[PDB]
């Protein structure tokens, strides 16, 4: 908490306030029960802080003035107005506050004041919490600078202080003393005639209740082969935590559920449905509630039974959806928001269903999975991106292979394909496309390349190679290269030998500035396709005519389909001469059972498991 | 739907602003009405600016259809997009300011609910004595070099090459030389448009940005080293302020060109050109040139980072809505003071009516707008508005102001700081003057008002004015004492004893609750600290004393019994919010009484069901309800078999009988749907008796509706007559129809 510096305009009131409150603390210390001592010793019940202002050392007074100044600057710069409203009852006004309560001890003791009849505003509690947090922060940084009562590489002493974390590692029971001191201080400040406001209230929206975006969205779906064509099927979805839970039926064939007409969903968090827009229908549920999505292909009506009660919209219609095409059937679908837990029940057993006798049996309803002898199988959205997709139809992709290498060979490959966008398309995506296409005095073979037009450079488009495993789909990239993982294998006794350095999923050159020439046109020797005749861990794939220490020596067996990185809006820069995460995926069905026991944390698995992979040609398939 | 911009309404406006057509204005209003819906709200880019400029230039004109078009457009613009006002706040404020001088004629000055969005110049500027500051050293030279390179590259594309001797036949251009050695005339020609643009931009006055990170002069990828290059810098999106600056520069350029055309036409002594056309009327042929010029200006201003640029967190400091609300309060207060000074000792009443229709109501969802608009001055402004409305309704009202007053008073329950401002003095004075409505029927009221004050209007207004069901907001100083006074007065008088045309005096108070033959006066005199209503002994004693009154309340009369039952229900309402769950035995007793009272009421035949306009919604109660339903089903079946044969008189009697039966069915079905949830919850677990009792009722209901025509045709007129609808099916906690959620729940079993 350090925003601005207190201006030197309130120096007189600041000094008067500091002097009287310091007097208040030193009388409080005097009346605590200790006594003044010429020397410092805890065994004699003597404390150096119990010294009157006339005999206090200069260092202690300077430290007191400094902490008073820092605290006043913090409370002034927090955001609340701390202007003078009522004058203090010292040498300016007399309001009988000081002689209200008087105490006599063995020494000088003036009459203090204690005003507690005023209402305890939450602003005082906020001030106390902020001051305690500031004290914990300065204590933690003081410990960090000097390394006291802990040790990482030194271990000077044991019994580490739990003061490192100012909020979680510290409990209010341990900090009762300074909490009480802060409460007394703010009570005396209230008694002095000072007005304060609480920002964390309904008057001002200074606090944020939700923070997030459309990320980490998982859609749970069933098999495409389990679609239905007739009859009525019932299933229950027990909602545990209220939140974004869109439940309905999806038609097979990233995207938010219910955005278009492919799938239907319902949710009570906003108590409205999603089908090609926003329509008010139904009501909010609570914890331990079911939805009960119904389907009836005989007359194409959809309804929902919330705890045995049919939900109705504002128009008083019992049918949620009407006049929809049958298509290739519908399958159960669920959506789970951030920190939300669901519970599916396809109807394996009659006794498992809760709200089934109330509405199901009388109307002639059957569970969705009442006839299946085997366990049901369900899919989920794959959060990890994969490159195993060729872009067939997109919003602005018009790929068309043209071959003109016969006779006329201007660029050998002679291929044109429109890959640029139209307008409002910038979400940093990485492109990948399929490839259905010793000698003396030679330089390199396989003279093929992907054409680009580096005449604009909107965001310093990077060019380089790509490894087999890329799971770093993030907006920010090319700032750390994941990690420069190095291997120092060897004897490691008195000499290090054969310390071969490895590489992570980072084979893309930065290409910030090849040369300060600024050549015209667009052809400047871009990503020339060159492969060394003999494999030695070095490949010549660069977009510049000069070498800049980018050898990147690694192990062989890395060649795959081409992929390049780019970011723009609509310059039609990408030509030939996508990462998705909405693909369904199933985790497991034969998950093992593990047993954990106290005092050892033993885990046992006596059931072996086995599964195989694919053997598709081109010698690369395992999904 | 248009492609990029329409040019129809501009032509329609240009034709309506003059009276060349005669009786032809009716051939374009349907065109405008049809084309308004075709075009979306995103097609209005320059049209709102021209509309605002024309409204500011002239507010009152002979074009009465303009307000109709504005109202239609604003009513049809209430979509789900919820577009921002942006530039709409100025024309609405100007119209509000200028609407006072107009008098009253036509209905064009009534539909003000759309206000506040439900919440040639030949010489524009003069640069005769404007000097360009000498802040240019390098960027102008770079721009001139780029322009020369582009021009020479364009001339090279045509087939011109650099040479030493100029020759048009050989296509030789010796101008391919650096700008440091170019001719003075060519340099001046190239510099003149740039100098004029710089002078125009510096004439108005705007901030200039000189950030060091904007140095993008050389960032994109012949003789004396002449190597021209082509740079495509039109792919960069630019801010809206620079777009507006470029639009203003283009407008100035077009005005200058039009002035030059006018000068060259005047010098020739004759001629005309059809190019004197505004931007919104321009065609694509000149639109392409305008877009090219705008792109060139954007590319010119994008290099070197030259960007041209032009309070407290409260409604008063910077929010336009808070300013508009405060201003509207100011004018309504000024008008109220003027009316109270002049009238109280022509178009004034008209403008007063317009400003009370517009000032009092601004949005249908007034509660959310008030909650999200302000919290400090909202209460005092509402209190001032209520006081002004009360003072204006004190005198004789000409028009009907009941609905607007009810809408204004309904916003009180949905805290207000009544300690800062006390505006309850007028309400307390009115309550004191009307402390006994059956007893103060005399000339005590000023001017002897037969219907201005001594009528049902004040009784109906008191229901909406006093409503604290959600949370109390009064000072709790005189309101509890006044409530105790009204309770004591109603206790003293068991009958109504009202005046003529005042039978519905039950709907008078909606806050009959504790601390919200009495000895209240003695307690107040003795205390005058703690009010006697603070103790819970007094409400309990009052309830125990009152209980025999409705315990023994049973009469066979028609109107006096009905009005006594209504008064007992109102004075003993079930909204006991003072710890309802704590007094479990009292709650059960009240529920039993309020469930047994309708049974004893409906025990009689009750051929007339118009006495109760809207009645207030265990095993013994369920059995009694089932017995009553079975008895009424038997009676209805008997009536059906009696009316099957022995045809009655003309259709008037049959229609009246069917209407009475429909009213009785609706009245019974209200309670049936109210108790259906409880019956279903009782029968769901282990009770089959409820279903076994409801099955004959469902069978009788199905048989009655199996074949009926007179009921079918009279249901429509019964629903039309009873405009009040409850619609309690959606709450799940023509008031009712034949088939609703209750029927589906009953048939579900």
PDB file of C-alpha atoms in Angstrom, chain A residues 203 206 283 308-310 312-313 318 358 362-363 454-457 518-521 524 569-572, chain B residues 218-221 228-235 313 375 680 684 729-730 732 740-741 744-745 748-749:
ATOM      1  CA  UNK A 203     -23.128   2.574  -2.097  1.00  0.00           C
ATOM      2  CA  UNK A 206     -15.549  -0.910  -5.308  1.00  0.00           C
ATOM      3  CA  UNK A 283     -37.160 -21.070 -12.751  1.00  0.00           C
ATOM      4  CA  UNK A 308     -41.660 -33.498 -10.313  1.00  0.00           C
ATOM      5  CA  UNK A 309     -42.957 -30.035 -11.263  1.00  0.00           C
ATOM      6  CA  UNK A 310     -43.297 -29.014 -14.908  1.00  0.00           C
ATOM      7  CA  UNK A 312     -43.555 -23.067 -17.537  1.00  0.00           C
ATOM      8  CA  UNK A 313     -42.537 -19.838 -19.246  1.00  0.00           C
ATOM      9  CA  UNK A 318     -45.971 -26.455 -21.287  1.00  0.00           C
ATOM     10  CA  UNK A 358     -43.772 -39.089  -9.215  1.00  0.00           C
ATOM     11  CA  UNK A 362     -47.819 -42.691 -14.782  1.00  0.00           C
ATOM     12  CA  UNK A 363     -47.022 -40.916 -18.062  1.00  0.00           C
ATOM     13  CA  UNK A 454       6.235 -10.284 -45.148  1.00  0.00           C
ATOM     14  CA  UNK A 455       5.557  -6.768 -46.422  1.00  0.00           C
ATOM     15  CA  UNK A 456       3.302  -5.815 -43.502  1.00  0.00           C
ATOM     16  CA  UNK A 457       4.497  -7.617 -40.322  1.00  0.00           C
ATOM     17  CA  UNK A 518      14.096  -2.529 -45.324  1.00  0.00           C
ATOM     18  CA  UNK A 519      13.916  -4.124 -48.749  1.00  0.00           C
ATOM     19  CA  UNK A 520      10.941  -3.520 -51.011  1.00  0.00           C
ATOM     20  CA  UNK A 521       8.473  -5.990 -52.594  1.00  0.00           C
ATOM     21  CA  UNK A 524      13.279 -11.772 -49.678  1.00  0.00           C
ATOM     22  CA  UNK A 569      -6.587  -9.477 -38.956  1.00  0.00           C
ATOM     23  CA  UNK A 570      -7.167  -9.604 -42.737  1.00  0.00           C
ATOM     24  CA  UNK A 571      -4.091  -8.969 -44.954  1.00  0.00           C
ATOM     25  CA  UNK A 572      -4.544 -12.169 -47.054  1.00  0.00           C
TER      26      UNK A 572
ATOM     27  CA  UNK B 218      10.576   3.526 -41.949  1.00  0.00           C
ATOM     28  CA  UNK B 219       9.138   0.288 -40.552  1.00  0.00           C
ATOM     29  CA  UNK B 220       7.367  -1.388 -43.482  1.00  0.00           C
ATOM     30  CA  UNK B 221       9.130  -3.883 -45.737  1.00  0.00           C
ATOM     31  CA  UNK B 228      10.751   3.727 -54.898  1.00  0.00           C
ATOM     32  CA  UNK B 229       8.669   1.301 -52.858  1.00  0.00           C
ATOM     33  CA  UNK B 230       4.960   0.651 -52.350  1.00  0.00           C
ATOM     34  CA  UNK B 231       3.602   0.697 -48.789  1.00  0.00           C
ATOM     35  CA  UNK B 232       0.138  -0.612 -47.863  1.00  0.00           C
ATOM     36  CA  UNK B 233      -0.713   1.179 -44.607  1.00  0.00           C
ATOM     37  CA  UNK B 234      -4.510   1.116 -45.053  1.00  0.00           C
ATOM     38  CA  UNK B 235      -4.919  -2.133 -43.073  1.00  0.00           C
ATOM     39  CA  UNK B 313     -18.001   9.205  -9.454  1.00  0.00           C
ATOM     40  CA  UNK B 375     -29.567   6.764  -3.738  1.00  0.00           C
ATOM     41  CA  UNK B 680     -50.630 -32.564  -4.037  1.00  0.00           C
ATOM     42  CA  UNK B 684     -47.616 -37.403  -2.704  1.00  0.00           C
ATOM     43  CA  UNK B 729     -49.950 -20.371 -12.124  1.00  0.00           C
ATOM     44  CA  UNK B 730     -46.470 -19.004 -12.838  1.00  0.00           C
ATOM     45  CA  UNK B 732     -45.968 -21.580  -8.026  1.00  0.00           C
ATOM     46  CA  UNK B 740     -54.225 -24.003 -16.709  1.00  0.00           C
ATOM     47  CA  UNK B 741     -51.385 -25.449 -14.625  1.00  0.00           C
ATOM     48  CA  UNK B 744     -52.633 -30.324 -15.618  1.00  0.00           C
ATOM     49  CA  UNK B 745     -51.481 -30.989 -12.046  1.00  0.00           C
ATOM     50  CA  UNK B 748     -51.308 -35.794 -13.715  1.00  0.00           C
ATOM     51  CA  UNK B 749     -52.260 -37.786 -10.578  1.00  0.00           C
TER      52      UNK B 749
END
